[PDB]
Amino acid sequence: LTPNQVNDELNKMQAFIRKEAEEKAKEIQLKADQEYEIEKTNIVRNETNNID
Amino acid sequence: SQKNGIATLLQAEKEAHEIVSKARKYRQDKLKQAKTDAAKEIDSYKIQKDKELKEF
Amino acid sequence: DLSVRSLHDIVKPEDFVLNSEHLTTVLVAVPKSLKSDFEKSYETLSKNVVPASASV
């Protein structure tokens, strides 16, 4: 290999590793806000009918 | 350069895994939180209805 | 002969991985005539190859 081809892959691959890390954690915590609401509403509305 | 290129990219992945792991933690927190904030709405609604029975 | 052989008397975390989250290792048995051609071409054969990992 030559010195440029070795740096060319190193910059491109480590970009991707970061991009995939960001993409997976962001999607999981994006789903965390949604899921919080489903459950807080669900527990309330079922048990509010019981109160009524 | 075998042990520098592999070692550095793999360390990057060990960091990448740790961020994903924090967002999973975040998500577990939001489930516990959800049961908690629903509990605080029931028992305030409970006594509102008990107020208007006592008024009656 | 390389058509049923893969190393497993020895195992190192810088020659083999698959317990990462992003990284794997694939072993390529390349004919000895084709050997110099493998070192030149391997990086280019697919995207996002770990730089300087090809060794015998």
Q: Is B10 touching A (CB cutoff 8 A)?
A: no
Grouping H, G, I as helix, E, B as strand and the rest as coil, residue C43 is helix
Q: Look at residues A26, C24, C44 and name the one whose alpha carbon lies nearest to residue B10.
A: C24
Q: For C27, phi and psi rounded to 5 degrees?
A: -105, 140
Closest C-alpha among B55, B32, B44 to residue A51: B44
Distance (Å, whole) CA A34 – CA C31: 55
| Triad C38, A8, C37: Cα angle to 5° | 10
| Cβ-nearest to C53 among B5, B13, B20 | B5
Q: Is B19 exposed, middle or buried (0-12, 13-18, 19+ CB in 10 A)?
A: middle
Which method resolved this structure?
Answer: cryo-EM
In Å, what is the CA distance from B38 to each residue of A51, A52, B24?
A: 14, 16, 22
CB A6, CB C52: distance < 8 Å: yes
| Closest residue by Cα to residue C39 from B6, B3, A2 | A2
CB proximity A7 to C under 8 Å: yes
From the list C17, C22, C53, the residue facing B2 with the nearest CB is C53
A17 touches chain C (CB under 8 A): yes
Kindly determine whether residue C22 and residue B4, on different chains, have CB atoms separated by under 8 Å.
no
Residue B31: CB partners within 8 Å, gap ≥ 6? A35, A36, A39
CA distances from B5 to A14, A49, B48, C53 (A): 11, 62, 66, 7
Which chain C residues contact residue A23 at CB under 8 A?
A: none
**Burial (Cβ within 10 Å: 0-12, 13-18, ≥19) of residue C47:** exposed
H or E element at residue A31: helix A3-51
Looking at the partner chain, which of B1, B3, B13 has a beta carbon nearest the beta carbon of C23? B13
Q: Looking at chain C, which residue has its C-alpha nearest residue A16?
A: C48
Which helix or strand (DSSP H or E) is residue A33 part of? helix A3-51
Q: Do C51 and A12 touch (CB under 8 A)?
A: no
**DSSP state, residue B26:** H
The helix/strand count (H/E) of chain C reads as 1, 0
User: Structure tokens of C20?
Assistant: 């990462």
Instruction: Report the candidate in B16, B47, C32 with the shortest Cα–Cα distance to residue A51.
Output: B47
Q: Which one of B2, B4, B15, B20 makes the best mutation probe of the A interface by having the most chain A beta carbons within 10 Å?
A: B20
What's the alpha-carbon Rg for chain C, to the nearest Å?
Answer: 12
The amino acid at B27 = R
